C-alpha cells in the first residue's frame, strides 16, 4: 500500500527510546517473501522525529497519502496484514487459523512488556542520565529539546505506577526493593508470553516476535542491562537468552536495501516554523 512511515531514529538507525520503531525497521527488513513484500512495497520510511504528524502523538505513524494515519507498531502491522492482495526463511504471514493468537501476542507485548521498557529508558535513573537524555538533543530541533521527553517520563510514571510504583544505606534498601518488583514483573510477563508463543510455531519468526525482541534489544542494551541479562538467565537459562540475542544480532546487522527512505520535507521535521504552524492549526 502506498504511503510514508514516520519513525524516531536518525540516519537509517531507529532510536532506542522506541521499541516500536526498532521493530518497524526490522519488519520492513524481513519482508522479503512475495506475499510479505507486496504489503510493504510502497512504504518510504521517514525518520521525521516529530509527533505532530501523528494521530496519537506517538511516532510509529503510517500515513497513507489519502489522510489515513495508523499509529503504533501493532496497529500498523495489523493494517498491513489486512491490505494483502492474497493472490520459511524470514518474516512469514500468519494464517487465518492463528490470526487471533498473533494479535493477542502482539497486544501483550505492547501493553505489558513495552510498559516495562518505558520504565527502563525513563524511570531508571542510572539508565536515563547516562544514556537517554543524551538522545533528544540529536533527534529533535533546537528549542524543543526538553519539553518532549518531559511528557515521556510523566507518561512512563503513569503507565508503571501500579507495579514498581545514612541516606545511602536507605537508598539501597529502596532500589533493591524496586529491582525485585521489576524482576518479578519481568519474570512473569516474559513467562506468560513465551508459554503462549509455543502454541503458534517454534520455528518461524513473526510480527509479535519482532516487538518482543526489540524490547529485549533495548532492555539488555541500556547501561543497566547487565543485571537484567543476569536475572533473565537465572530463570530462563543461558541457551534461550543467547538464542534470543543471536536473533537480535541478526536484525541489526541486516542490510537496508529493501528500506527505501527519504528526507522529511518542509511539512515534517518539527521545525520552529513547522511546529508553531501545527500549534496554530491545533487551536484555530
Amino acid at each position: 500500500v502506498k504511503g510514508s512511515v514516520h519513525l524516531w531514529g536518525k540516519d537509517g538507525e531507529a532510536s532506542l527510546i522506541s521499541v516500536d520503531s526498532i521493530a518497524l525497521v526490522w519488519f520492513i527488513k524481513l519482508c522479503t517473501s512475495e506475499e510479505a513484500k507486496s504489503m510493504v512495497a510502497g512504504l518510504q520510511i521517514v525518520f521525521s522525529n516529530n509527533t505532530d504528524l501523528s494521530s496519537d502523538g506517538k511516532l510509529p505513524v503510517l500515513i497513507l497519502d489519502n489522510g489515513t494515519k495508523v499509529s503504533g507498531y501493532v496497529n500498523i502491522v495489523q493494517f498491513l496484514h489486512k491490505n494483502i492482495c492474497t493472490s520459511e526463511e524470514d518474516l512469514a504471514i500468519v494464517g487465518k487459523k492463528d490470526r487471533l493468537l498473533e494479535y493477542s501476542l502482539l497486544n501483550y507485548v505492547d501493553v505489558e512488556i513495552s510498559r516495562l521498557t518505558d520504565y527502563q529508558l525513563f524511570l531508571n535513573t542510572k539508565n536515563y542520565n547516562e544514556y537517554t537524555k543524551k538522545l533528544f538533543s540529536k533527534l529533535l530541533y533546537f528549542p524543543m529539546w526538553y519539553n518532549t521527553p518531559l511528557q515521556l517520563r510523566s507518561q512512563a510514571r503513569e503507565n508503571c505506577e501500579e507495579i514498581i510504583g545514612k541516606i545511602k544505606g536507605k537508598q539501597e534498601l529502596q532500589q533493591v526493593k524496586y529491582n525485585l518488583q521489576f524482576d518479578n514483573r519481568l519474570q512473569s510477563c516474559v513467562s506468560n508470553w513465551l508459554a503462549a508463543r509455543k502454541k503458534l510455531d517454534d520455528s518461524v519468526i513473526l510480527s509479535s516476535d519482532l516487538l518482543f525482541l526489540a524490547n529485549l534489544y533495548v532492555q539488555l542494551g541500556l547501561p543497566d542491562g547487565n543485571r537484567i541479562r543476569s536475572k533473565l538467565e537465572q530463570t530462563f537459562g543461558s541457551e534461550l537468552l543467547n538464542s534470543m540475542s543471536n536473533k537480535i544480532d541478526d536484525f541489526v546487522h541486516r542490510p537496508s536495501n529493501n528500506l527505501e527512505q527519504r528526507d522529511p520535507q518542509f511539512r515534517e521535521q518539527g521545525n520552529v516554523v513547522m511546529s508553531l504552524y501545527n500549534l496554530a492549526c491545533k487551536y484555530i
Partner: protein, 348 residues
C-alpha cells in the same frame, strides 16, 4: 496597650496562615527598657497548630532583642507531604533613607518529621531520602542577616536596589549561606516602564566530620513555584530521588521583569501593571571539595521560563495572574504551564 489583632495572610498553593495576636506594652517597674510581649496563634491549611510567644525589648535607640519561643506544627512539600513538629526558642538581636540592619540570632529547636503521605499514594515521599529524614532532631543554629534595602518602596518599587545576605551556622553540622540582590530601574516620566532584576544565590556546606550527619530536607535549598521561578510547581526543580525534590546544596535563581502600567486612560493611576517576566535557575547537590566545581555545575543546565501576565500590587500582597510557558527545563521538573495565580510578598 493590649491590642488583640488578627489576620489570615493569603499565600501561594492556597493556604490560610490565619493569625491571631495578643500584646502587652509593659510598664517600667518590671523592666526599664521598652518591652513588648506577644502571643500568636496561627491556623492555615498547612498549619496544624502554631503558638508563638515573642518578647521585643528596645535596648538602645538602635537595638532590639527578641526572645521568640515557638511551638509549631505545619505541613510541608505539598502533594500530601511531611508534617513538621517544631518547638524551641530563638534569641535574636537586631541592630538598626536607605534601610540597613544586621540581625544576629541564636535558635534552639527540637524538630520532628512525620511522613504523613498515607502510602496508598504509592511512590510519593517514600524514596530512600525521605524515609531517612523521618525522626526527631535537636539543633542549635547561629545566624546573621544583613539587609541593605536602598529602594524607595518595599511596596511598589520604582528606584533603588536591595541586598539580603543571610548566613546560618549550625556548629559542627552545616553552614548555610544565602545571597539575594534586587535592582529596580524605571524609564519614563510617569514611572511607566519598571525594569526589575532579582538574582538569588546560595551555598550550603556540610561541616560534619568525613561527611556524616546529613543536612535535613527542611534546611536544604528548594527551587520553583510562583514566589520563585515561575512556570514550575513548588519544590519543582532540582534533583530527585524517586519523585521527591530532595533539595540542593547550592543554587542560583535569577529573574527579570517589566511592568507597563496598563495603558488605558481611566485606570492609569492604579496598581495594575502589565507583567512580562523571565525567570530561571539551577539547584545542585555539589561535592563539598571545591568552590570551582560548585560554580561549574551551577551554570551548565538551567531550567528557565518566560511568560506574560497581569500584576496587582496591594499593601500586604502582590496578586499575579500569569500565563507562563517554560522555555528550558530539566527532565524531572514539575511543569506548570498555562495560567497560574500568584499571591504573596516575595517574588523572584
Amino acid at each position: 496597650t493590649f491590642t488583640a489583632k488578627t489576620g489570615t495572610n493569603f499565600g501561594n498553593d492556597n493556604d490560610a496562615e490565619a493569625y491571631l495576636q495578643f500584646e502587652k506594652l509593659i510598664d517600667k517597674k518590671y523592666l526599664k527598657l521598652p518591652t513588648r510581649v506577644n502571643l500568636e496563634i496561627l491556623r492555615g491549611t498547612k498549619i496544624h497548630s502554631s503558638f508563638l510567644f515573642n518578647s521585643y525589648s528596645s535596648l538602645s535607640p538602635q537595638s532590639i532583642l527578641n526572645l521568640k519561643v515557638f511551638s509549631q506544627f505545619y505541613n510541608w512539600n505539598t502533594n500530601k507531604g511531611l508534617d513538621i513538629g517544631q518547638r524551641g526558642a530563638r534569641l535574636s538581636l537586631r541592630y538598626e533613607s536607605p534601610t540597613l540592619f544586621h540581625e544576629w540570632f541564636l535558635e534552639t529547636c527540637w524538630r520532628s518529621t512525620k511522613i504523613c503521605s498515607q502510602g496508598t499514594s504509592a511512590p510519593y515521599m517514600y524514596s530512600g531520602t525521605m524515609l531517612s529524614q523521618a525522626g526527631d532532631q535537636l539543633r542549635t543554629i547561629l545566624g546573621h542577616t544583613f539587609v541593605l534595602d536602598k529602594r524607595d518602596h518595599i511596596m511598589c518599587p520604582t528606584k533603588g536596589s536591595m541586598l539580603k545576605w543571610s548566613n546560618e551556622l549550625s556548629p559542627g553540622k552545616h553552614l548555610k549561606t544565602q545571597l539575594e540582590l534586587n535592582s529596580v530601574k524605571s524609564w519614563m516620566n510617569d514611572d511607566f516602564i519598571t525594569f526589575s532584576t532579582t538574582i538569588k544565590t546560595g551555598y550550603l556546606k556540610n561541616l560534619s566530620s568525613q561527611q556524616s550527619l546529613p543536612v535535613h530536607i527542611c534546611d536544604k535549598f528548594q527551587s520553583g513555584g510562583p514566589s520563585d521561578i515561575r512556570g514550575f510547581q513548588t519544590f519543582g526543580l532540582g534533583p530527585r530521588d524517586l519523585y521527591d525534590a530532595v533539595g540542593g546544596d547550592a543554587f542560583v535563581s535569577y529573574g527579570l521583569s517589566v511592568f507597563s502600567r496598563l495603558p488605558w486612560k481611566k485606570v492609569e493611576k492604579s496598581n495594575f501593571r502589565l507583567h512580562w517576566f523571565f525567570n530561571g535557575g539551577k539547584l545542585v547537590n555539589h561535592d563539598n571539595t571545591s568552590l570551582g566545581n560548585c560554580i561549574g555545575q551551577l551554570s551548565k543546565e538551567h531550567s528557565t521560563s518566560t511568560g506574560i501576565g497581569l500584576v496587582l500590587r496591594h499593601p500586604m500582597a502582590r496578586f499575579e495572574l500569569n500565563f507562563t510557558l517554560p522555555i528550558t527545563a530539566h527532565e524531572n521538573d514539575l511543569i506548570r504551564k498555562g495560567f497560574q495565580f500568584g499571591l504573596g510578598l516575595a517574588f523572584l
